[PDB]
Structures are given as structure tokens and as C-alpha cells.
């Protein structure tokens, strides 16, 4: 037969091939064999170790035949001796762990990389172990080949991970086609002590959840930044995939590349490839705000990005959850970050009353939506604090004390709903300037049902019908005659966030509050003007004081724009006005009432909240809910809220006329029996609170879900919105508005 020298492939850079496998008695070593395999440009192995393997009467044919039934079974990919040797055979690479050092190091064929040698290894020492003699030695030149891309061009089969942290949460997949070795045995084989809401990885199939990600398949984003994956991204889906499966292991402490190292169990050069990419994903994952976020918090010079990203300076309006989410991850990044808000206090719409004797109240936002892959429950595991989930009871009580049978309940729901659906065929061919209100369209589509049907309801079912209605108000923070029939639920049509509903019990306030930790924060500075017409951004605050930056992010309530309470030089423009104002300023109130003891817990027998019947549509929304703030059932604090019409009506009620109405209503609703006086109370005004005047936002008539991204949009790469009314996906919470300032924050350190 004929041998070469040279690489079965043109144009491969090794000059000498050598042989890494040197498994056969015959292996050609350096020099002549009839083919030279190629998996990269500085591995290869000969012919006679090809035989070894591949050969019925050779040695190495048990442990091949071995290997390829188990990878068969396991994974879609081929079996070949190529694929085998990268998964077997090809000797494994390390950096040293000496910080002035990080030399890669080849380790001899017999010693298997385990995640204590990587954070262990040095120079010269034995693995799983002098002086530093051996640190000064040059790098295998093969070393340095790896970081061009051309080498990655050249490397014929993608790595495939061993032992991946993430192995354990996708076990669905076929491990090859998430990157993983489909011959590793924990591989094949919810992590215990992993918090139940993170569920970071869709299942095969699996869509409608917020913030999950395909372990399968990348998304936009991620190709526009790394476009090297498109053709295959198994080797990108592998690291990603990791990245995450650390951060929610240990989402109390930054997750640097140093941490992923040793968990990156891969033979060949290729390993040194994963290392340099996993640095680069991990940027790009944590200047998104995927990783390293939350109420995380760093000192100088541990900065979560490179000194790169720094070079920037930033002023944000506003020390609500967006602005403050805003800032912690600017400042968290190594930017300069200066926040000016209006108010004596730092919340916004999150403000907590700590005076009611062993339970903390919520005078704005205190419940979660959908705790699964909520960063709201990201930042509760975080600071060690616990939430309640909601039982489903909700008695509807009527004023004489009565209560509802929960027949009558669920059979009213399902009329109601009835009125919706037919809502939703009515509008699927109907354009913008075709919209009607929402509470004009369901009375209509009522009336009709009674002509059409005849049927005869109960007053009691025509008040529960009311009591379904005020749901509705409530949820949208007004009357249905301004909300728009066509796009009131428009952000139903993504991903919402699965899982628990939940009380916050120790409230928002602790989350703002490690959020806002060490920042510059400066109170009672209303901003009054802000000019971008200059090479800086000027901020002039009501008194006169000027504040200066490159860029700046406005995070004031939908309300405040639509008023113009900052006037913007130059203004803004008549797209992003129309925008603001299709949306409407929705507004809820709440009160909240203490009591000498639980006079409720015989009759509620320990639901988390009841139901208030209205006795007439024109007290609709007034208490129709009233929630038990105690979840162990010691304390006696009841919260209740007013909502559609009725906030309207106490408007110009004094907060001890709205106090005696709620009385008059418990004792209606415990008629039966005696309810002590409260002994402390608060009302709140956030419709009358100057730089607030609203709850949440929702799409009046005529206006689309399209205009939170417009709101959303920056100008110039200079002025950039966040907050609940610029989050189209996650609209009205806490949690999309601190997602809209992590989002912010994410655009502005990229320039
Ligand atoms: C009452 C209430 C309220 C008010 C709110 C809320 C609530 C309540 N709650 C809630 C809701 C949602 C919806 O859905 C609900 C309801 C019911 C149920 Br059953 C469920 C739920 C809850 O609970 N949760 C949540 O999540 N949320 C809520 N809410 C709402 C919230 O709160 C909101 O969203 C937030 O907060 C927003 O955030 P932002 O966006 O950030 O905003 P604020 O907070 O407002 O902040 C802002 C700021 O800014 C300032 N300013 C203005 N202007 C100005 C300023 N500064 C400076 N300068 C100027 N010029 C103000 O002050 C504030 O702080
Ligand atoms: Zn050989
Ligand atoms: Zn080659
Ligand atoms: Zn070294």
C-alpha cells in the first residue's frame, strides 16, 4: 500500500500530523501511514489506530462495538471511529490555575478531566496533586491555532459536553442534539435543592411560557451576535444551556467564567474553544440580563461586564421598580448611574406600610402573577424570603350576610365568559378605527341573549353577574366603557408567566429596597426638563438643579407623559405622543383596616379572601374583594380595594367617610353578627398623588398593543423609556416593569 505524510485534508495548517491515539502496536507515531484522520487542525490520528478500533480482529474492536451500541441508543448522532476518538481517546486539555499563569496544558491520554483538576491544576504538577519553574514554559502552539475562527471552520464534528449541570433538566432531548455526549452515564441517567419556580428550559414541543428558552434551538438574538452558530448550534446550545443551569443552581453569587471552567468536561483543543466561547456567551447573557441579576449586588472592579461596557454615564428618572432595576444593572455593570426622583421616597407604585403589628401591607402592589421563571420570585430566593400561594376558595357574600352557593358563582363565570368569547369573534375582522368599548360591546351582546334565550336570572344572579363584571374592571384598572373591545387582552396573544399566583408577603418594599441598596439616589427632585440637543444630556429638576449625563431613561408613569409633566428638548415626537395617549391610566384604590381580632374566621373558615355581592350596578367595584393580609391566620388585618366606578365615587369622599362606608359594608356582610370597630386604617389616593395618578395602564378604545413598544422605543440612542406602560408582553406589574429596566438597561450598555 502507499502511506502519506500528510492530513488527509487540503489545506489543513499541521505541517507533521502526528498521532494523539497511539493505540496500536503499529501506530505510525510521526511519520508515514496510508491515512492521516482528521478531526482539527492539531489532532489527528493514523491508520493502523483507525484499524484498532474499526477492525473486527483488532484489539480496540470490544471496546468500540462497546461504545457504538450505547451511542446509537442514546443520541442521533453517527457513530464512527472519528466520533469516537473526540468522545474516547483525545487527551484532554486545562489551564493552569495560577491567576498570573492560565496556560492551557495537555494532560497525558490516561488522566480523565474532572472539574477538581481544573480548579486545581498547575504547571508541571502531577493532576489531582512545587515551585513555578514550569509556568514560564511557551504553550503548545496548537493552543493558539484555537482561537481563530478558520480552526473552528476546519474541526470536523461539533464537541459534545460530559457531566452538564443542565443533563438533569433535559432529559427529553436526545443529549447530542442539546450538546451533550450521548455516551455519558449521569447524562443518560427538577434538580433536588433547585427552587421549584425556576424552570428555565421549555419542554420537546412545550410553548405559552414566559421566559422559558428552547435548549434546542437559538433565538434571534443570539445568531445576530453569533452568527458562527447558525449552520450548527450544538456547541453554543451546550454552553448556554450550562450558563443557565448555574445561575438558577446558585443565583446568589455572580457566575464569572472561572465558575463555568471546571464544569466543561470536553476532550481535545476543543475544550479550549468552549472556554473562550463560554466567556463571551456569558457577557452577552448577562448584559441581556439573563444571569447575573436580580438584587445581586458587586463591588469595584468585580463588575459584571468588561471594562469595555463602561465607558458610558446615565441618568434615570424615576426610583420605581423599572428605574431601580435600571440602575442596580447599570451599576452592577461598572456605569455610572445617578437616579433623581420626584418623591420623599423610593417604590413608585410599590409603598409599604410597616406600622399594622405583624404583617407588612401593601398601600400600592403586593401580589405575583405566575411565580414560575418570574425574576420577582428570582429576587425572593435571592433574599431568603418566602411568598403565599392563594387558595382557589372565594365565597361571594351578599349584604344581609348570605352566602352565594358556589354553583351560582361558576354558572354566572361561565355567562360571563360566554359575552367575552363573543367578543373575541366579533372583533376578528376589525380594524382600529372599527373599535368599540368593551363594556358597551358585552351589554349589547347581554341584552341580545336575554331577547334571544329568554331566560329569567335571579336578582341574586344578576348581582353575582356584576360581581364578574367588576373582576374585569378591576384587572384593568377601569370601567369597561373606556377600555377597548378589540385589545383589552392583546398581551394574552404571548407567553404569560406560569405557575403560582402569590402573595407577597413581606413585600415589594424589601425587593426595592435591596435594589436601590448604595446607589446615587437623589430624593425630592422632580425633573422638570430634559435636553438632548447638546453633546450631553442636560436634567434640570423643578428647583434649578442641573444634572448632566450621555444618555438618560425616563421611567414616570404612563399619566405623567400623557400630561407632560417634563418637557423634552426636542420634543417629542407626534408617533410616540399618539402612542401614549392610546393607552389609558387605569386606577384602582385600596384600604386597608385592623381589627382587635379575626371576627371573620368562623364564617371564611381561613380562605385567603371573600367576595363582596354588589347589591346594585351602580355600587359596582366598591370592596368587591376583601383579602385576610395574614396567611398564618394570627393577625386580623383585612385589605380591600375599590376599582371601576367606584373610584369615581370616593374621590371626594374624606378617608373617614370612605373608612365608614367599608364598615357599613362588613357589617352588611356579617350581619348576622358583631364586627368590632377598626383600630387603625389607611386609605390610599394614588389617582391624586402628583407624580403618579394612576395603578397600571391598559388599551383604551381605538388603541393597540403596539404602542408599549412605541413608548418603548429610544430616541437617537440617546433617550430611552422604561415602566409597566412600555412592557407590550408583561404590561400594569412589578414584574414587567422591572423587565422593561433590565431591558433598558441591556440597550444602553451595548452602545
Ligand atoms: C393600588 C395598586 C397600585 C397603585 C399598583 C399595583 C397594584 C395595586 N397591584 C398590582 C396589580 C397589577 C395588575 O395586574 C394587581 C392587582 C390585582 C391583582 Br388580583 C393582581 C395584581 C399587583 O398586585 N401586582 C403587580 O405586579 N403590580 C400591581 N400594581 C402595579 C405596579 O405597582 C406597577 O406596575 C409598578 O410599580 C410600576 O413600576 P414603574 O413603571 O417603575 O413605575 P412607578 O412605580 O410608578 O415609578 C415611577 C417613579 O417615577 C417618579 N417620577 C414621576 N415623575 C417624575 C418622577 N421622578 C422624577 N421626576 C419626575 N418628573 C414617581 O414618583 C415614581 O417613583
Ligand atoms: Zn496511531
Ligand atoms: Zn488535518
Ligand atoms: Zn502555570
Redesign the pocket.
Known amino acids: 500500500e502507499k502511506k502519506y505524510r500528510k492530513c488527509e485534508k487540503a489545506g489543513c495548517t499541521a505541517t507533521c500530523p502526528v498521532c494523539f491515539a497511539s493505540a496500536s502496536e503499529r501506530c505510525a507515531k510521526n511519520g508515514y501511514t496510508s491515512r492521516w484522520y482528521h478531526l482539527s487542525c492539531g489532532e489527528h490520528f493514523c491508520n493502523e489506530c483507525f484499524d484498532h478500533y474499526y477492525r473486527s480482529h483488532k484489539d480496540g474492536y470490544d471496546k468500540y462495538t462497546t461504545w457504538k451500541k450505547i451511542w446509537t441508543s442514546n443520541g442521533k448522532t453517527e457513530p464512527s471511529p472519528k466520533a469516537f476518538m473526540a468522545d474516547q481517546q483525545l487527551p484532554y486539555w486545562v489551564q493552569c490555575t495560577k491567576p498570573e499563569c492560565r496556560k492551557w496544558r495537555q494532560l497525558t491520554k490516561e488522566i480523565q478531566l474532572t472539574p477538581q483538576i481544573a480548579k486545581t491544576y498547575r504547571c508541571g504538577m502531577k493532576p489531582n496533586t512545587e515551585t513555578s519553574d514550569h509556568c514560564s514554559l511557551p504553550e503548545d502552539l496548537r493552543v493558539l491555532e484555537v482561537s481563530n475562527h478558520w480552526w473552528y471552520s476546519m474541526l470536523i464534528l461539533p464537541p459534545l459536553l460530559k457531566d452538564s449541570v443542565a443533563a438533569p433538566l433535559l432529559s427529553a432531548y436526545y443529549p447530542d442534539c442539546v450538546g451533550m455526549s450521548p455516551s455519558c452515564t449521569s447524562t443518560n441517567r427538577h434538580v433536588p435543592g433547585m427552587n421549584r419556580y425556576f424552570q428555565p428550559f421549555y419542554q420537546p414541543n412545550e410553548c405559552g411560557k414566559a421566559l422559558c428558552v428552547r435548549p434546542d434551538v437559538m433565538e434571534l438574538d443570539e445568531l445576530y451576535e453569533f452568527p458562527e452558530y447558525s449552520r450548527d448550534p450544538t456547541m453554543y446550545l451546550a454552553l448556554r444551556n450550562l450558563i443557565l443551569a448555574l445561575w438558577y443552581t446558585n443565583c446568589k453569587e455572580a457566575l464569572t467564567p472561572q465558575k463555568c471552567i471546571p464544569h466543561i468536561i470536553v476532550r481535545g483543543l476543543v475544550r479550549i474553544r468552549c472556554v473562550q466561547e463560554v466567556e463571551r456567551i456569558l457577557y452577552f447573557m448577562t448584559r441581556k440580563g439573563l444571569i447575573n441579576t436580580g438584587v445581586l449586588s458587586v463591588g469595584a472592579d468585580q463588575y459584571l461586564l468588561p471594562k469595555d461596557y463602561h465607558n458610558k454615564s446615565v441618568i434615570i428618572?424615576?426610583?420605581?421598580?423599572?428605574?431601580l432595576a435600571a440602575a442596580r444593572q447599570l451599576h452592577n455593570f461598572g456605569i455610572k448611574v445617578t437616579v433623581?426622583?420626584?418623591?420623599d421616597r423610593?417604590?413608585?407604585?410599590?409603598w409599604d406600610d410597616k406600622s399594622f403589628k405583624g404583617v407588612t401591607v401593601?398601600?400600592?402592589?403586593?401580589?405575583?402573577?405566575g411565580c414560575i421563571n418570574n425574576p420577582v420570585a428570582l429576587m425572593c430566593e435571592q433574599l431568603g424570603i418566602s411568598m403565599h400561594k392563594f387558595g382557589e376558595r372565594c365565597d361571594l357574600i351578599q349584604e344581609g350576610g348570605r352566602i352565594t352557593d358556589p354553583t351560582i358563582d361558576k354558572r354566572m363565570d361561565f355567562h360571563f365568559n360566554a359575552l367575552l368569547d363573543v367578543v373575541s369573534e366579533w372583533r376578528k375582522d376589525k380594524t382600529q378605527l372599527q373599535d368599540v368599548p368593551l363594556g358597551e360591546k358585552i351589554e349589547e351582546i347581554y341584552k341580545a341573549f336575554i331577547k334571544e334565550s329568554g331566560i329569567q336570572f335571579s336578582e341574586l344572579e344578576g348581582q353575582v353577574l356584576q360581581f364578574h363584571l367588576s373582576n374585569l374592571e378591576?384587572?384593568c384598572g377601569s370601567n369597561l366603557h373606556q377600555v377597548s373591545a378589540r385589545s383589552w387582552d392583546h398581551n394574552e396573544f404571548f407567553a404569560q408567566f406560569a405557575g403560582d399566583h402569590t402573595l407577597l408577603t413581606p413585600g415589594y418594599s424589601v425587593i426595592i429596597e435591596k435594589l436601590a441598596e448604595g446607589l446615587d439616589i437623589q430624593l425630592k427632585?422632580?425633573?422638570?426638563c430634559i435636553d438632548y440637543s447638546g453633546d450631553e444630556v442636560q436634567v434640570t429638576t423643578t428647583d434649578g438643579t442641573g444634572y448632566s449625563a450621555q444618555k438618560v431613561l425616563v421611567?414616570?408613569?404612563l399619566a405623567?407623559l400623557q400630561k407632560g409633566?417634563?418637557q423634552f428638548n426636542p420634543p417629542l415626537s407626534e408617533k410616540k405622543m399618539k402612542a401614549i395617549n392610546s393607552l389609558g391610566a387605569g386606577i384602582?384604590?385600596?384600604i386597608a383596616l385592623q381589627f382587635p381580632y379575626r371576627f371573620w374566621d368562623s364564617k371564611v373558615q381561613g380562605a385567603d379572601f371573600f367576595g363582596h355581592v354588589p347589591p346594585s350596578a351602580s355600587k359596582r367595584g366598591l370592596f368587591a374583594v376583601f383579602y385576610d393580609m395574614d396567611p398564618q391566620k394570627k393577625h386580623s388585618v383585612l385589605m380591600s380595594?375599590i376599582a371601576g366606578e367606584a373610584v369615581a365615587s370616593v374621590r371626594t369622599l374624606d378617608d373617614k367617610q370612605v373608612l365608614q362606608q367599608c364598615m357599613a359594608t362588613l357589617r352588611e356582610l356579617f350581619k348576622e353578627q358583631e364586627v368590632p370597630d377598626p383600630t387603625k386604617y389607611f386609605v390610599?389616593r394614588?389617582s391624586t398623588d402628583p407624580?403618579?395618578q394612576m395603578?397600571?395602564s391598559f388599551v383604551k378604545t381605538g388603541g393597540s398593543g403596539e404602542a408599549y413598544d412605541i413608548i418603548a422605543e429610544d430616541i437617537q440612542g440617546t433617550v430611552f423609556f422604561?415602566?409597566?406602560?412600555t412592557n407590550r408582553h408583561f404590561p400594569?406589574?412589578?414584574?414587567?416593569?422591572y423587565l422593561?429596566?433590565v431591558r433598558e438597561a441591556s440597550k444602553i450598555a451595548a452602545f
Open positions: 428618572i424615576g426610583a420605581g421598580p423599572a428605574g433623581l426622583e420626584a418623591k423610593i417604590g413608585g407604585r410599590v401593601g398601600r400600592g402592589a403586593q401580589i405575583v402573577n378591576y384587572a427632585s422632580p425633573v422638570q421611567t414616570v408613569p405623567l409633566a417634563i384602582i384604590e385600596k380595594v390610599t394614588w407624580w403618579i395603578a397600571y422604561a415602566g409597566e406602560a400594569q406589574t412589578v414584574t414587567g416593569a422593561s429596566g
